[PDB]
Amino acid sequence: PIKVYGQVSLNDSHNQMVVHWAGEKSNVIVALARDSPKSSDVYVSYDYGKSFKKISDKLNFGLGNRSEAVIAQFYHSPADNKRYIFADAYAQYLWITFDFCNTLQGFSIPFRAADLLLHSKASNLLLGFDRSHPNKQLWKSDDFGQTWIMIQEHVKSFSWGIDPYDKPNTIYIERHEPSGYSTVFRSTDFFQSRENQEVILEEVRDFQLRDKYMFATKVVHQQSSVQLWVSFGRKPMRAAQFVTRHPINEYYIADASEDQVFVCVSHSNNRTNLYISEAEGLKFSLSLENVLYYSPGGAGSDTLVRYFANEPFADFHRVEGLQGVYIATLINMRSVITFDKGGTWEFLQAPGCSLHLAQMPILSKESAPGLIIATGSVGKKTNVYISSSAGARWREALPGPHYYTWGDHGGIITAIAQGMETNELKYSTNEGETWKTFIFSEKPVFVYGLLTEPGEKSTVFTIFGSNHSWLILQVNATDALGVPCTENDYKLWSPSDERGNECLLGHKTVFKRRTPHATCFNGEDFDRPVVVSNCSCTREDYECDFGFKMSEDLSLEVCVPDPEFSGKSYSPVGSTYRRTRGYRKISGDTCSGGDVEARLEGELVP
Ligand SMILES: *[C@@H]1O[C@H](CO)[C@@H](O)[C@H](O)[C@H]1NC(C)=O
Ligand SMILES: *[C@@H]1O[C@H](CO)[C@@H](O)[C@H](O)[C@H]1NC(C)=O
Ligand SMILES: *[C@@H]1O[C@H](CO)[C@@H](O)[C@H](O)[C@H]1NC(C)=O
């Protein structure tokens, strides 16, 4: 029903191992073994993981130099999955391949390659940032790392532009300056001429680019305070309004991907406050207080929080595949979820008790709309919890901590116990309502990774671990799904909140998906909603207005005046101006008509 078709032990005793399939239409897998750096090894499969060949000896410093290569990091081009760069940890040196590591060539380079930033569309183009010097130099290559020019020195921060919003080759940069105040510049010819260069904002402290938005900071006064500046869709930057009684030291941009900005301000007692804007990103309202926040700390002069997306400091998580849905943890903790980008929040429940989600991460994808797997616990021992209702309802799927992944649009889910040795793969074809066991090897292993072969329809899983000696297995589970799904095996589904509203963000979205109990191969792409239709407005289409905050008791769902406004939340006796009741329609909400829209919307006042 399921078979292990590839199993390979690498006579290798490094303490880290990463394994990456080249991509969806590809038989190549690259594996990199590293320490915690003291040594490394590289292995490549050209047969879907049936066999791996050691190719570390191809990574050498050339004729008459025998000193061993030590790979810190490798990089895969997202524009061309045949291309890789392996960077030496110590020497100023790279190896590049254009053919899945069949041929590698070494190149000595004028900096150590701490961080390379490969362009997402132009496969020859990349940046390199020399972080070892305090001299802070940005290097650019247009031949995939063979030759490099130094395009900017004294770099405080920089970023590639983003398509489609920026012209081709766009780079944004800000330099360190003796005064501490600096200019954000944009160039389309790598800073080679005045004519292809543009001032974006001046007297800036920091800057960041995130999707359609750009953020920068200035200082105002009389204690000084940091003012946030924002651009939406590459229009000129404008000052955001953040009214508080006390100085703001920094902003954390938590998310800017759904036509609004979530921003966190303050980090007292490992808590922060979550604010949301409308589309322009300029008028923020307090959506959620006391969100868990843990950072390692920084030098003390950062005004925009730097962090990696896969390691957010705020316990706040966008659910993929769905607009509107985010999950957070607040504080004696509680997990909450929103279905309307922070307009209202609800407590998560399992069978009911309060469900607390440790964010082992939350797994969700556009290829399986409404399916979420997460790790957490109930009351007061971690288990695996599953929702197939976009987080509205949850069940406990498996007890104990596990790796989990899935294939074929969520139609087959796999799980392996973590933190103990095992030779057991759990699999479910019904969203975790039942599970079968497949013994994937005779002897137990500590498992360190569980992956799905890329491709939305894939039903091949990679397992790697050891008992130190690395083992890599490939499990083909295709036959566990049997024959192709037919019309009988699909049902219409609309995401809803916990109350049953299938009307989210002012419209009803309809997906065609495979029923929970159908055992069949789903060969269809139904990732994109079949029907969308508008609804009459409800409370759920509204959020707190500038000057207001969510009631402390979230279940009241009432917006009240924010004390930070010092009693001036409602300030303008003439004409017919529009006085807010505390609410504004959520950015991108398409609701229309009905009772609620009236007297949630502003009041006409003389
Ligand atoms: C070999 O060449 C590399 C890269 O140029 C250099 O960094 C290293 O010092 C060399 N090692 C020896 C033993 O000559
Ligand atoms: C897995 O099994 C299916 C059905 O037998 C086959 O079509 C598919 O190519 C296999 N995949 C791999 C990577 O062996
Ligand atoms: C729903 O409303 C939006 C504007 O709010 C409009 O653009 C869209 O055409 C409407 N869609 C449907 C399917 O009626």
Curated annotation (Swiss-Prot):
Protein name, entry field: Sortilin-related receptor
Lipoprotein as UniProt keyword: no
Compartments, as annotated in UniProt: Golgi apparatus membrane; Golgi apparatus, trans-Golgi network membrane; Endosome membrane; Early endosome membrane
Disease per UniProt entry: Alzheimer disease: Alzheimer disease is a neurodegenerative disorder characterized by progressive dementia, loss of cognitive abilities, and deposition of fibrillar amyloid proteins as intraneuronal neurofibrillary tangles, extracellular amyloid plaques and vascular amyloid deposits. The major constituents of these plaques are neurotoxic amyloid-beta protein 40 and amyloid-beta protein 42, that are produced by the proteolysis of the transmembrane APP protein. The cytotoxic C-terminal fragments (CTFs) and the caspase-cleaved products, such as C31, are also implicated in neuronal death.
Residues recorded as bearing Phosphoserine in the entry: 26
UniProt keyword terms in alphabetical order: Alzheimer disease, Amyloidosis, Cell membrane, Cleavage on pair of basic residues, Cytoplasmic vesicle, Disease variant, Disulfide bond, EGF-like domain, Endocytosis, Endoplasmic reticulum, Endosome, Glycoprotein, Golgi apparatus, Membrane, Neurodegeneration, Phosphoprotein, Receptor, Repeat, Secreted, Signal, Transmembrane, Transmembrane helix, Transport
Entry GO CC: cell surface; cytosol; early endosome; early endosome membrane; endoplasmic reticulum; endoplasmic reticulum membrane; endosome; endosome membrane
GO biological process, one term: endosome to plasma membrane protein transport
